[PDB]
Each structure stands twice: as structure tokens, then as C-alpha cells.
Amino acid sequence: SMLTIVQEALTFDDVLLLPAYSTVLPKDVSLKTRLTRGIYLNIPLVSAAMDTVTESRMAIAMAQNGGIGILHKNMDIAAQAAEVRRVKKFEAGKAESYPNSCKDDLGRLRVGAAVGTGADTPSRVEALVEAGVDVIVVDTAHGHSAGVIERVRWVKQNFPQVQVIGGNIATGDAALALLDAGADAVKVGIGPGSICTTRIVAGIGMPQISAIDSVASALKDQIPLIADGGIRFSGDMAKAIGAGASTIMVGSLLAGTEEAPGEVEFFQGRYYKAYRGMGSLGAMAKLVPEGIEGRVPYKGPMGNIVHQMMGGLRSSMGYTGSAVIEDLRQNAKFVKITSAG
Amino acid sequence: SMLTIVQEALTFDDVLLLPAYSTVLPKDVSLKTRLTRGIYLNIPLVSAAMDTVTESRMAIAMAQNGGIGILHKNMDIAAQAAEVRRVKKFEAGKAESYPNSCKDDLGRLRVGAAVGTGADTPSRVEALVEAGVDVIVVDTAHGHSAGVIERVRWVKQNFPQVQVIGGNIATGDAALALLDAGADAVKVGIGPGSICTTRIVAGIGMPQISAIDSVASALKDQIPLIADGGIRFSGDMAKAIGAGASTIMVGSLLAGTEEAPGEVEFFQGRYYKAYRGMGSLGAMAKLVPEGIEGRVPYKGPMGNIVHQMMGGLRSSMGYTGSAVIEDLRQNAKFVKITSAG
Amino acid sequence: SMLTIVQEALTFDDVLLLPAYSTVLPKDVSLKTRLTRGIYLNIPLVSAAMDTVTESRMAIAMAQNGGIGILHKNMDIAAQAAEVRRVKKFEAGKAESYPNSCKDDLGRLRVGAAVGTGADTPSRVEALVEAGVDVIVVDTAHGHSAGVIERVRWVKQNFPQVQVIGGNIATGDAALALLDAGADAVKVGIGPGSICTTRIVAGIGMPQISAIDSVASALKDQIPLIADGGIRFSGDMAKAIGAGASTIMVGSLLAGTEEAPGEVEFFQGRYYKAYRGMGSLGAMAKLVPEGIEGRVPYKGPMGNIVHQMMGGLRSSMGYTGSAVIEDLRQNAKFVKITSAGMS
Amino acid sequence: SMLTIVQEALTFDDVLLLPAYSTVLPKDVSLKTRLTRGIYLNIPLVSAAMDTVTESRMAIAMAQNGGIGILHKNMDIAAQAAEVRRVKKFEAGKAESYPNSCKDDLGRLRVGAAVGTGADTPSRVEALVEAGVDVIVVDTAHGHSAGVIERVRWVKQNFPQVQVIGGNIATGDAALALLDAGADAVKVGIGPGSICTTRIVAGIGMPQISAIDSVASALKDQIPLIADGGIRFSGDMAKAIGAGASTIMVGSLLAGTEEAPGEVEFFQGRYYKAYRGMGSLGAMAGKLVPEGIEGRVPYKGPMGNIVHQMMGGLRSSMGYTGSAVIEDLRQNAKFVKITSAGMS
Amino acid sequence: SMLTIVQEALTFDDVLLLPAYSTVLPKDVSLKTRLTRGIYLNIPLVSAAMDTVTESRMAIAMAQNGGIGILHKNMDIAAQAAEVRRVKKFEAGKAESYPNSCKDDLGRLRVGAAVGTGADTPSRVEALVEAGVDVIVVDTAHGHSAGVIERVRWVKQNFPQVQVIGGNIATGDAALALLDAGADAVKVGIGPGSICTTRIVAGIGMPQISAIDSVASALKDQIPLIADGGIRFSGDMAKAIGAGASTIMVGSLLAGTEEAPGEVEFFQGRYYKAYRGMGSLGAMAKLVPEGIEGRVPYKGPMGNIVHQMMGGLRSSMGYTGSAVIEDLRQNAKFVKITSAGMS
Ligand SMILES: C[C@H](Nc1ccc2ncc3c(c2c1)CCOC3)C(=O)Nc1ccc(Cl)nc1
Ligand SMILES: C[C@H](Nc1ccc2ncc3c(c2c1)CCOC3)C(=O)Nc1ccc(Cl)nc1
Ligand SMILES: C[C@H](Nc1ccc2ncc3c(c2c1)CCOC3)C(=O)Nc1ccc(Cl)nc1
Ligand SMILES: C[C@H](Nc1ccc2ncc3c(c2c1)CCOC3)C(=O)Nc1ccc(Cl)nc1
Ligand SMILES: C[C@H](Nc1ccc2ncc3c(c2c1)CCOC3)C(=O)Nc1ccc(Cl)nc1
Ligand SMILES: O=c1[nH]cnc2c1ncn2[C@@H]1O[C@H](COP(=O)(O)O)[C@@H](O)[C@H]1O
Ligand SMILES: O=c1[nH]cnc2c1ncn2[C@@H]1O[C@H](COP(=O)(O)O)[C@@H](O)[C@H]1O
Ligand SMILES: O=c1[nH]cnc2c1ncn2[C@@H]1O[C@H](COP(=O)(O)O)[C@@H](O)[C@H]1O
Ligand SMILES: O=c1[nH]cnc2c1ncn2[C@@H]1O[C@H](COP(=O)(O)O)[C@@H](O)[C@H]1O
Ligand SMILES: O=c1[nH]cnc2c1ncn2[C@@H]1O[C@H](COP(=O)(O)O)[C@@H](O)[C@H]1O
């Protein structure tokens, strides 16, 4: 009676995309999309800014495949800036054809970098911009805050030559606040991550399909949104884009690949790599932890998993008659399914 | 807000048929139904066009039991045509009575054959028609496509003497497209198969009860529909027909029978046979796979399982007072149930 | 669009009874109720007409505890009649007191007996009435049928001196058909039984809370209904009565008791008794089977389990302020819960 | 100190056969063997005398494949005699060829039949012999008993025209007692059966490799022995024969085949057939405490495929051991004992 | 009494090596050993002749790491000869250093090739020798057979310029027969493989530690033996060598590496490669199958697994005071442990 229930909110498993009349085969769909209003990608995939997912080796591979990597901020300003320079200066071998590379106007691979909102941020942003970073990601657990909103405005006013992303958010109200602060895109996801315990610790969250819809509906395509967290299968990517996302950010799916940070580890015969939330105890070494720490099976070169995922999205776009990403964003139709489905 | 949710879609487990006033005992119900507007069956069962389910041996057994088999197209044109001749030329032993046999005007067992939409299709259809096939099934993963619609029209205009089925579809819109192209029946099922991973790979699907209803409601009985996939129990068959289906196609339920292709294999003391999606890696050896491959327990002669399944349908029709299949299609009443039941 | 969905139907696990203002303690609640319009019980419990639940030994114990047993029909006419006489003639020892016994006008323990609708039924009913049976249960899987409706009418017209129950049904329409045929009560339950496979084999069923409500709403208390099947806990009994039931029938809960038919068998060091659906292969040994056969753990004397169950019902009536059964039937209020409220 | 431990007794899983110098390929080995001193089989396989394993249908298939079936005795005398006659007079169509059929000197398929030691045994034996049975199996839980010994001698004395097997036994002492009674073979197995609970109920039993060895060592091939119970894999058959068995009897392995008695049951999507010990509760109904269990086995299809697989494994084993004929394996086999780690 | 039990035979899990007085550190031990009397390796590791383990890519990697690969024979003669030549003429690239490479007198990487005893064997041997193969492995399930013994003798008499290995065997008697036939080494292993079902199908086998000991004791170092099958951990390698082996052959350990044949398949979100016995139904497509067919996790570059395995062996040799492989072969002392110590 006094309980304010805004909606019944939906996650990936609550919905299915409907097939529609199609004259496009999966092999012919275009996966080109925009990361921000100023940066386009050749595939809608972004690697998570996590110290077990994205350092320079992953970022290079992501850009070589047409996506982009967000360097995590769990490292010194000098280290993060060197990581940026490694990507911007990377030169492919003489027998290395990457025709879908995501590059800036100077022919250099694109890369992003995460920053916080604390006292070190101005120096960190300056160093990253000096090194040639393409986009600054003001990246916190709660983007709908004075700290994030004002830091986004500060990056936009002081470094207009770089693109800036703000997050994480889960509501249209948060999206409009970041839009008015000057963000070139927003990152959506409070609660969906595979290693998230925010739902348990804080009781806070927004099922990701309804989060994407709420943000996309408010933005009216003024800036794109990145759907961050909860992607377990390629089918989740198609659902996210059909719900309004322009790109997808993944951590678990890229953890354990050769290019992800960390050494492979022998354990019970099998090979593993570490994967941990940035709000886990180890990552933070004050707030109680909001992420778990675990192992993911060794996956080999990231290009394999990326090919599998993009192949699944191509199949979905064939089913929906979507020749280009914007077709899926605009024309997707869903059904809600029950627990039995 | 911008998220288009067409409906909450229901699968078999979401609904139950209600008992109704009955003056018919299960033993006296008639299971006769129509496969296409021109072909009638004595039972509503169709064996899947899969290379672990239906070759000539299964097709003969299906027809002898009053149903029909759809020979899979994972074989050469000449091989598939020889299979058709095997069924059309089959003569039962002089101490074997199959009074419910499904036969053509010439007294030959009926059989169907699957074809695709690619360049080999014209020659394949011509070879199959010449061999005496009763029905051509233009079967793809996505029947709501120009390729399938135009190939169905091509078969109807060029081989009016054969019946043609188009699929697979999941919406009334798709059914009307195939109806207007000349289909004699449509096959319904996107996502429900037991070996299906399309839901996970592409995020695509339609819970099968709502798929049947959407298609049946648009067709208004102008042509019948085949409910293809997701049948695990005889109860599912009754639900599918009550929702509007005229026949049921099954793979898993007939996989592992003696008549299904493949050898029985010893594994942990027990006998199995292989069962795999036609979009599995093995079946395909480029689309990423959308089906799994596994083992199913050995089931002995298919007549046993067919008898069990039809006995359950007879029971259901006794409970609903349905003396003939069309009674169940017209008078079925359902309740929706929760996850607790 | 063409799909006819009558309702979202609820089972026991979908609902909870709400506590209400109470000035009655569980110990002071009255469990008296009516089995039929002419037969009252001292507790709302009926033992199932199953060959692993109710023969004369269970029927005697049920009546002694204030309920009634329905003797199963998986036996010869002379056998079932003898079972009836065993109950009607039973004499308790002068050192055993059962003050709540359910007895007829002659002071004899009450008992019921199931019959079918086939050719043997007229003779079977005649033998059972001759032996003193209190109620005939025309008992089939599908009571909404000409066979059951007309057999109920025949028993009422030819043997007006006995009470008659018809079932099983799951809809108000079926209840009214049996009412018009002269049923003194109806038995409700299509699908809910613990050993049922009808939902899987036939795709047929009605979640039991909605079945009870549909039947009770149509009858408007002209005759009572027996809620048959799916009772796993004492809480299900309160829910069933709150939804409109006057009595509940149980098989699984009384299977494995000392008084149930069958010898104990200890298997892997533990004692069990058989429990099987009457539509199971073994029971029928043609319709495909619609029930399973299994073992239930040994439970000892049935009086204990009956005491546990009625104690749970008494607690619920304390929570709901229900001093008598009819209070719970008339005043119960429910909430619907989600899957997380169950788990 | 006072505890009498005769030996450490070994089961199938305790031992492995060793490879040896070999010149004969598995495809060329001979599987012919003795059932009794007077009856040979073309393969060393006997189907168990159990009402879920062997009636006339199974017995016919066993003989067609070169083995033999023992008809169970859980039926009245007339019924069991009729089962014998069904096997003895079965004629195959000329469209089917069973070149390895096991037949008597008249060209009729061979068959055996079980009898007990109860009061109906004289009439049952007479009826089975009159029906043409090839071998009478005096079949009890405890062959080393006056009852079985006396009944074996009685059959030999009154019906010398039939072969007689006595069992079940587990020691050389028991074997010599049945030999002296006139038995033409002994059946070895107390404890090993898949559905046996004798070990739990009575604390009685003998691991089957040592049982075979104990019996074979005492008999010194004067008569053959049937290794009855505990066979799970073809490898068990080779080990049993290497330990001295001339044939093996199987129940579980042939239960659930098309030819076994009983209808296929549909249970949770899968097909099964019943399999139960003859000392189970249900078997003793239609006063000892039960000593067997009752359950389901997966449906296995035609028994011929199972038999072919088992004999294929034995052919492989004989190739490894350099055994051209069954007697080579019986006389020349070498074993190693393995630890629990070797079994894991 | 008549049962002939040769011994209680031991597998790897039955025994442990004892530490001994030691002066050389693991980093300083020598892992050099001999594959045959004429061929030395820099590490005691051989990749199995299986179509899911060793083709030319794996053989090159084995040789570069100091071991050797045995090319499987499940391919026609021209294909297997071409695989030999691919290894023999492989030339490392610039900035590529493999200081431990195992090479012939001409500086070419070593490689072996399996042959059977079937009708194509004479032509296959001739082609493999002509292609520069270093060792012919006459490889069957049963080396103690006229077929293998006579084929070994044929290779030695007609192609003396090549080394020849015979197997598989499990007894000293078999070892002497192959020695007499002219074998330059024998391969030991009947039953121990990870994918073996010979023990279940045929009841045949010899626990691998006792097999190694029986063979080594009979040979008295006249020729070396390859311990083939059952290796799961680096500790198994040390035990095998301490029991008398000069090299070990592995299949499962190298299956799933990047260099093994076959593509990585995606399954339940994890990556795998096929691994199957050469006696499995899949590989054979008449004997009943004696191996299983499955999938193993993807392991990445084989160099990492080899490095881990050799690291474990170096540790073991540090514990045993073994500065070179022959020290471990000659001086190892064992204890037998119970199933409680294996817990
Ligand atoms: C301890 C916790 N650490 C992290 C770190 C990285 C994250 N990255 C993404 C997301 C979350 C993250 C939480 C949580 C919400 O879902 C997305 C965190 O900072 N908690 C937190 C709680 C409330 C407020 Cl006001 N400020 C911060
Ligand atoms: C690889 C995959 N292979 C199969 C094969 C047989 C099938 N048979 C029935 C069904 C499906 C099947 C998928 C999937 C949908 O549910 C029913 C397939 O062709 N994918 C696909 C995706 C999108 C488009 Cl445009 N075209 C094709
Ligand atoms: C084989 C099956 N045997 C039983 C036996 C006792 C039962 N007792 C109670 C209930 C059911 C029972 C089913 C099933 C429905 O739920 C309550 C049965 O008779 N099937 C059946 C189906 C359709 C029609 Cl027309 N007639 C009968
Ligand atoms: C109850 C039990 N019934 C059976 C029936 C068939 C059997 N068939 C083979 C075997 C056994 C069997 C037991 C048990 C030993 O292992 C082989 C049986 O008769 N017990 C028994 C115990 C002691 C004595 Cl003096 N007499 C008999
Ligand atoms: C079917 C079976 N196929 C294989 C193939 C490769 C093997 N490779 C190594 C090993 C074994 C292998 C068995 C089995 C023993 O352990 C080592 C095989 O040929 N059986 C066999 C049995 C008896 C005889 Cl006389 N000849 C051969
Ligand atoms: O400790 C944490 N708690 C909650 N969310 C986190 C934490 N660390 C990272 N995340 C988020 O989870 C995403 C990874 O989600 P995943 O792809 O489902 O594994 C990241 O991109 C972050 O948005
Ligand atoms: O690889 C595949 N993916 C998805 N659906 C498939 C695939 N192969 C076959 N199907 C469908 O699944 C049906 C069999 O479903 P089932 O009866 O539930 O086993 C077939 O008749 C096809 O419509
Ligand atoms: O074979 C059967 N199938 C379905 N329902 C049955 C069968 N046999 C008995 N029943 C019903 O199940 C009730 C027992 O249900 P329970 O108390 O949940 O064990 C009986 O009173 C009958 O109404
Ligand atoms: O009730 C029983 N208890 C113990 N052994 C039995 C019983 N019934 C049969 N057997 C034995 O078990 C054998 C079958 O063993 P199996 O091949 O391991 O299943 C029969 O041939 C009998 O010797
Ligand atoms: O099918 C088979 N059955 C038994 N042994 C086999 C089979 N295929 C290969 N082997 C042996 O097993 C070894 C590999 O064993 P692993 O290293 O334990 O996986 C090979 O080198 C062969 O000696």
C-alpha cells in the first residue's frame, strides 16, 4: 500500500527474441555499432575493466577483432598510462592481417581506460589522455551520484578531445543526469555481473533487460549505452541489443583466455585462470566486499570465444531479419517466458 | 517502455487440459487426422527428419503404424530417392497384418522427404517426386524467410502432384506467408526441440503452446500444422493438439528405437543409440552449432513406444470427451499453472 | 487468441492462509464435519480406497479415531462384503476407550466401500448394502461421465437407504451434474495424487486448490465435497478446508502404517510398506498406466500420524480464529505466494 | 589362534590374466567345451534357472547360439515338461541358419531343467526325462547337503539315460561329495550372484575365483564345473575359465533380453524387465528369510547381441593367452593378484 | 591350489619412492636417457602413437623439447611418410632457440613411426625408412606374438639402418623374445592406459610397476624399455623410471594440447579436444573394442605440460640423490603402501 513497486523487472532468462521475416543470412549481417557518439566499433563487444580481464594484451586483441578493451584502474597511474601507450604503439607482424581492426584516425588501435572519482583522478586522466587513450570510463558501482556526474562533466569540460563514458547506472533518471553532464555514452549494470554479490550484500539491483530498456527509453538514442554484466551466452548479447544496447561489456566470458591477465594454474589436472570482482576482498587489497573471487577454466586464445559469440549474434540477426545492428535495436520483438521455459 | 513484449508465451509445462463431460472411452477414440490438406494419417505422429531418427526403416514402421516418416536430407539425392523407393516398394510379409497402415491411392506405404532451399533443391525435389514421395518438406531453421517461402511456391507451381510442407515457423505472420505461397501444411517449432541450443546461442524461440496457438489462430483451419519438437510425454501431444495442432513430429522419442538409424552401442553395460541435432557439430561436418549430440537409451522396436504414446493420447481424449481428433482441437480447455505444479 | 485458458489454477504450495483475530486455542477447536449430507464425522479425515491403504483393519482404526475408511474395490464382491461386516460387527475390548468414534444409529463403526461402473456394480452394491455399509463411493478416474453420473443416479434411486458419493471431478460443471443425479457428496481430485502420472500421461489435471474452489463455489453447500489427493502436510488439510472442502482423503499419509494392508519389508536395513496407484501396472495386473508403485517408510500405528495431522489442523484453526470447521470454510483468507515464497 | 581361516579367497576383480606367447588369432580359437562329462557345448555359456531368465524361448536361443538353457522350476510339473518339449521339437525355418547350434545325437536342440529336493521331485524328474530333457540340474542354495547328495544319486540310479548336475557348492570337499554321488558336473557359486544377499543374511559365501579353484583342484577334471554367478563382463568369463571352469552360468547378463521371460516395462521413459533372485520375497510367494533381491534391469534387445559381445571378449582373451582351445586356457592360464589400487 | 598366481602385481599408486642422501639440486640433474640402444633423448618422454595425440605437429614439438613423437599409423602409407618428412626437414625460425632439441647425426629432429603386422606393413616400413624415420615401432596390443616377433626380425634384417621397437609386452618372457628377434627397445604396457578396457573385455592386464620390473629384470639393460600407459602425474614418471624404465610414453597427458591433432570443440562453455583409444569403435572404423572414446580439456601449448612434468621429475631426483637418469634406475628404493596411504 505504501510499498512503491516501480515495475516487474526482467532479466535475460525472462525473455526470448521472436523470429521475423528475414532476407539476410547470418554470414551477411553487419556487426558495426557505436561505442560512444564519437567512436564506432566493428563488433559490439567490450572487455571489462577488471584486473583479471583487460590489460594491454587483452586490449590489443579486442581492438584487433573490431572491439575495444577498457584497461582496469587497479594499477598506478604510470602503469595504466604505459598500458595505453603499449596499445597505441602496437604494430602488427608482417604476416598479420586483421581487416576488422578498430582504429583511430591515426591508424592506431583504439583503447579505453577506467578512472575513479577520487583525488588521483585528475592526474590519472591527464596521463591517460597524454598517452593517447580514446575514451575515459568514469567507472564506479553507483554512477547516479554527485561524484560521478560531476567527474564526467569535469572530463568533458577539461578534455574535450577524448570521449567519456559514465557508469554504472540502471535507470533512465540516472541516464539523463549523465547525458546532461556531457557523457558520450553510459554504462548500464547494477547487479547482473556473474561475480556480483551486491544483490545479496545490499539488496540492490535491476534485472538487466529492464535496466537496458529504462536507460534506452530515456536516452532516445541521444547517446549509446553499454550493457555491462550478466552476459553468459551469445543469446544474451542479442537480447541486450534488442532491448536497446549498442555494445556489450563482458568479464567472465573473456576471463581465462590466453590474453587475459594472470598465469594459468594447474589444479586437479585442469588449467584455470583467476577471475574476481573488483569489489572482492583480494581486489580491494571501508566497504564490505561486493564481489566473489574464483577460477575460470583456461579457454585458449580469446579470438576463438569472440568468434563463437559473434557467430551466435549473427545467427540471431538472421532469425530477426536484422541486416545491421540498428535493425535489431529498432525492430526486436520479445515474448516473456515462465519459469518452466 | 520501448521494449516490445508481444505476450507471455506458454510451453507444455505451463498448462494442463481440463477434464470435461465424456461419453467416450479411451479404447474407442479415433486418432485419424490430416498431415496436409491432401494427406490423412491414422495416427497424428510424424518421425523427425533427422539422421539419427528417420531413414527408410523408420519410415516403413511409421507408415505401418498409421503415421508417416520424413526422410532426412543429410544424404545424397540418389541416396534419398532410393530410400523413398524402399518405402514405396515395400511389401509386408504374408504373416504380418497392419490394418492401420497409412497408404497412398495405390496401396503403397506413404513417406515424406525433407529438402533445403539451396541450389541442389530443384534436382532433389525432381528425384524425390519421380521416386513416388507423397510430401516434400521444405524444412529449415527459419521458415519465415524469402528462401523458404519462394521454394514452397516453386514446388507447388512445378510439382502440383505432390504435397508440400514449409517450416519451421513460430508466428501467425509466418503461417500466412506460407499459406499464400501454396503450402499444404506448415511445421511449427523454433526453440522447443530437446537437442536445441538456439535459445542459448541466438536468444531466439517461442514457447511451443503459444507458437501452436499463434499459427493455428491465423490459419483458421485452411491448412493443418505440424507441432515439431519439445514432445517428451504423451501428455504433451494432447496439449499440442488441444492448442491447435493436427499432427506431432518427434525426434527424441523415436531416437534409440531399433528402427532408427545407427548401431546400438555398449556403454557402462547398457545399450544406447546416438541422437543429435541437425545443427550439431557432427551433423554439420559457417553457422555456429545450434544443437547438441548425445546418447539415448535403447528402446527396442518403435511399435512399443508408439503404442505407449498413442495410449496416453487416447486417455486424454477420454478425459476431454473427444471422440475424434477434431473434437480435441475444437473443444480443448486449459488452465495455466504455476511453477509449484 | 484461439487458446481457451479458463484461469491460472492454484495448488496447495501456491497459497498461504492468513492469521486472523482469534479467541480460540488449538486444543479447544472442534474438528467435527460432514462426510455427506447425512453422515457426520468427528474428524475431517478419510482413508483412500486403495489396496495399499484401506481394508477392514484401516477402516476400523479410521472410525475409532472419528473418521472413516473407504474399502477399496480391488477385490471380489464377497471379499469386500466380508470386509464391511468385519467393521460393522467389530467390538473393541473393554479396556480400550475411543470416545470420538464415528458410529451409525446402531452404535456400529462407520465404513464406506468403493464401486466401479461396470457390469458387476449392481451385484456389488447390493452385497455392500446388505452387509451394512454406510456409504457407497462410485469411484473412477473421470466422474464427469455418463457412466458415473448414471450409476450414482441408480444407487440413489434403488438404494435410498445408503449414502452415495461420486467422483472424481475437478470442475463446478461436474459437481452440478452429480448433484442433479442425487449424489450425497462429491470427491474432488484429478491429477493431485502423490502417485499420479495422469498429468504426464494424459496432460490432464486441475491444481487442487482451484479444483476445490470451483466445486465448492458451484455447490453452494448443498452437498459437501471430499478433497482427494495431494495432501502431503497438515498445512495442506487446512488450506483444502479453507478453500471449501468438508473432508480430505489421503493415501500416501496413511500408507506404510501398521493398519494399512501389506506386510512390512525391511530393505537396506529399513522397514517399508508398498504404496501404489490403483492405475499402476501392478494394480491393474487396456489403459496405459497412470500411477506409480513404490515403497513408503514404515510409520507404526496410524493413530500417531492421525494425531500429528489433526494437531496441525488445530494449530491452523487457532491462527485463523476458527472454533469449528465451518468457521474455517467460511472465513478463510489466503495470499498467493511466488516461487521464492515456496522455496 | 583358534580361528580357522582356510585361505584368503579371491573374486574376479582380485586377479588379471597374463598375456603369453600366442600364434592363434582370436577369430580362429575354438570355444567348444564340456557342460557335463557326456554333453559338449559350442560356447561355454549357460543361462540361469531363474523365472526372469530362462523359459523355452531363452533355452531355444541359447542352444541355437551353441550354449544351453536351464529351465527354471518355479512352475508345475506339466508346465515344465511342456517347456522341455517345446525346445526339443523346435524346428527353424530353412531361411535361418544356426551353424553353431548345440544339439543331441538326434539333431534336436539341447535343454536342461532344474529340480529341487522337495516331495514332488521324483514325479518332476520322471516327467522331464520323459519329455527328452538332456540334463537334470538338482538345484539348491546348498549342494553340500544330504538332501542334494541323495537326490543326485537317486537320479543317476533311476534315470541313467540323463545327465545330472548338482549344486550349488563352493569347496573341494563339496565337489568330491557330489562326484561320489554320481554327478556328471557340479555347479559352483555361493555368494557371488548379482542379486545375492546370502552374504548379508547368513554371513556365508566364497569369492568366486577361489571357489572355482577349490572345486577344480579337488575334481582334477574328473567332471566339469559350471561357474554360476557374479559374471558381469566378458573378462569375468575368461578369468573363470582360466581358474578352472568349463562353463559359466549367467542370470543378470541375459535378464532384460527379448527372449527372457516377462514383458518390457515402461518406467520413467526407459524400458526394463524384471530380474529377481529365486530366494527373493516375490519368488518364494508365487519358511526361510529371503536371500535375494528383486528389481529391474534395462531392456537389452535380442540376446544374440549380448552373447556375441561376450564371446568376442573371450576370443580376445584367448588370443592374449595363446589359447587355441578352451582347455588351453583352463590348463595354461597364469594370473596376478592386484590391489585395490589396481581395481580403481 | 592349481590356481597359478605369479605375484601380487603393483601399479603406480601401490608404491612410493624413498628419499635418500642427496647432494645435487633438482635444477642440476641430467634428464638424458636412451629411447633405444642407438637413440638417446634429452628427456625421457615419448608421445603416444595415437590419432588424437601424435602427428607431425606434435612430433616436432616433442623433438624440440628433447623427446620424440611416434606418428600413428591410422593413415595411408603416403600420408604417414609425408608426416615423417615434415618432421625431418623442419627448420626452426629466427629468434627460435630449442637448445635441448633431440636431433640425428645430420642435425634433423628425430621422429618415430608406428606400423602394424597387416599386409601393408612391408610397403609401409620401406616408405617410412626412405623418408628418414629414425625408429620403426612395431606396435600392437600383443607384442608376445609370432606376428610381432617375426615382423621385428624382418625389419632388423631388411632395414638394419633403422632402429626398431616392439610391443606392447608385460612380462620378462616377452621381453626376451623381442630381444632375441633383434629389437632395439621394447614397449611395456598391457592394461594401464587411461582409455583401456582390455581389463574388462578380456580380463587381461599387468599392473604397470610390476610390468616394468618384470621386463627390466629380464633384459638386464641389454636394451631399454619404454613404459607406456597409465602416467597421470609427474610422480608416476619417477616411479616408472625407478622401477627400470628408460623412457615413458604418454597419451592422455598430451591429448588436448594445442599441438595434438584435432580442433578444439566448444561444449558447455568449456573447450575440449577428442581423445580416444586406438582400439575404440571410432578408431577401428573384427575384434570387440578395447578402448573408450571421449574428450579432454584444452591444455594449451604442450611445452607447459612437458615443463611441469620434467620439473616434477627433477624434484624426485633431488629427493633420491639421483644426478642422472641411470642413478634413479639403479638406486631407487620403494615402499608398498596400503589403500589407506592412497586415501
Ligand atoms: C564494494 C563495491 N565494489 C564494487 C566495485 C566495482 C563494481 N563494478 C560494478 C558494479 C559494482 C561494483 C562494486 C556494484 C554494482 O553493480 C555494478 C562498491 O564499490 N560498493 C559501493 C556501494 C555503494 C556505493 Cl554508494 N558505492 C560503492
Ligand atoms: C545451425 C542451425 N542448424 C539447424 C538445423 C536444423 C534445425 N531444425 C529445426 C530448428 C532449428 C534448426 C537449426 C533451429 C530453430 O528451431 C528449429 C541453423 O540452421 N541456424 C540458422 C540460424 C539463423 C538462420 Cl536465418 N538460419 C539458420
Ligand atoms: C489408468 C487410470 N487408472 C486410474 C485409477 C484410479 C484413479 N483414481 C483417481 C484418479 C485417477 C485414477 C486413474 C486419475 C485422475 O486423477 C484421479 C484410468 O482409469 N484412466 C482413465 C483415463 C481416461 C478415462 Cl475416460 N478413464 C480412465
Ligand atoms: C532362501 C534361499 N533361497 C535361495 C534360492 C535359490 C538360490 N540359488 C542359488 C544360491 C542361493 C539360493 C538361495 C543362495 C546361495 O548362493 C547360491 C535358500 O534356500 N537358503 C537356504 C539357506 C540354507 C539352507 Cl541349508 N538351505 C537354503
Ligand atoms: C581391439 C584391440 N585394439 C587395441 C589397439 C591398440 C592398443 N594399444 C595398446 C594396447 C592395447 C591396444 C588394443 C590393448 C592392450 O594394452 C595396450 C586389440 O587389438 N586387441 C587384441 C586382442 C587380442 C589380440 Cl591377440 N590382439 C589384439
Ligand atoms: O566486485 C564486483 N561486484 C559487482 N559487480 C562487479 C564487480 N567487479 C566487476 N563488476 C561488474 O561486473 C561486470 C562483469 O560481469 P560478467 O561479464 O557477468 O562477469 C564488470 O564489467 C563490472 O561492471
Ligand atoms: O540442431 C538442431 N537445433 C534445433 N532444433 C533442431 C535441431 N535438429 C533438429 N531440430 C528440431 O528438433 C526436432 C526434434 O525435437 P525433439 O522431438 O524434442 O527431440 C526436429 O524435428 C527439428 O524440428
Ligand atoms: O493410479 C492412480 N493415478 C492417479 N491417481 C490415483 C491413482 N490411484 C489412486 N489415485 C488417487 O490418489 C489419491 C491418493 O493421493 P495421495 O493422498 O496424494 O497419495 C487417491 O485417493 C485417488 O484419488
Ligand atoms: O535369491 C537368490 N539368492 C542368491 N543367489 C541366487 C538367488 N537366485 C539365484 N541365485 C544365483 O545367482 C545366479 C545368477 O547370478 P548373476 O549372473 O550374477 O545374476 C543364479 O544362477 C543362481 O546361482
Ligand atoms: O584402445 C586402446 N586400448 C588399450 N590401450 C590403448 C588403446 N589405445 C591406446 N592404448 C595404449 O594406451 C597408451 C596411452 O595411455 P595413457 O597415457 O594412460 O592415456 C598408448 O600409448 C597405448 O599403449
Numbering used by the authors:
A (entry chain F), B (entry chain E): 0 to 94, 204 to 393, 412 to 467
C (entry chain H), E (entry chain D): 0 to 94, 204 to 393, 412 to 469
D (entry chain A): 0 to 94, 204 to 394, 412 to 469
The authors write:
GuaB catalyzes the oxidation of the substrate inosine-5´-monophosphate (IMP) to xanthosine 5´-monophosphate (XMP) using NAD+ as a cofactor, and guanosine 5´-monophosphate (GMP) synthase converts XMP to guanosine 5'- monophosphate (GMP) to generate guanine nucleotides essential for cell growth and viability. Indeed, genetic studies have shown that de novo guanine biosynthesis is essential for growth and viability of bacteria both in vitro and in vivo (10–23). Here, we present the first high resolution co-crystal structures of A. baumannii, S. aureus, and E. coli GuaB proteins (cystathionine beta-synthase (CBS) domains deleted), each determined with a matched set of three different inhibitors bound. Similarly, the NAD+ binding region, also where our compounds bind, occurs at the junction between neighboring molecules with side chains from both protomers contributing to ligand binding interactions.
The A. baumannii protein consistently crystallized in space group P21 with eight copies in the asu, forming an octamer composed of two inverted tetramers, relatively rotated to interdigitate the labile “finger” loops (residues 371–381) that mediate much of the tetramer:tetramer interface. We observed a tight overlay of structures across the bacterial strains, highlighting common critical interactions required for potency. These inhibitors mimic the NADH/IMP cofactor interactions by forming strong π-π stacking interactions with IMP while also hydrogen bonding with the conserved glycine (Gly299Ab/302Sa/300Ec) which is one of the two hydrogen bond interactions observed with the NADH amide. The ligand linker segment induces a 90° bend, directing either the amide N-H of G2 and G1 or the imidazole of G8 to form an important hydrogen bond to the conserved glutamic acid (Glu416Ab/417Sa/415Ec) while directing the aryl tail group into a hydrophobic shelf region. This Glu residue underpins species selectivity, because the human homologs (IMPDH1/2) contain a Gln residue at this position that effectively prevents binding. Differences in the polarity of a particular key selectivity residue specifically (Ser250 in E. coli versus Ala252 in S. aureus and Ala249 in A. baumannii) was found to be critical for inhibitor interaction with GuaB which corroborates the observations of previous reports. Enzymatic mechanism of inhibition studies showed GuaBi binds to A. baumannii GuaB uncompetitively with respect to IMP, and via a mixed non-competitive binding type with respect to NAD+. G1 was designed specifically to remove the hydroxy-alcohol that is a substrate of extra-hepatic alcohol-dehydrogenase metabolism, and retained excellent biochemical and in vivo potency. G2 was bactericidal against A. baumannii at 5× Fu/MIC, and G1 was bactericidal above 2× Fu/MIC.
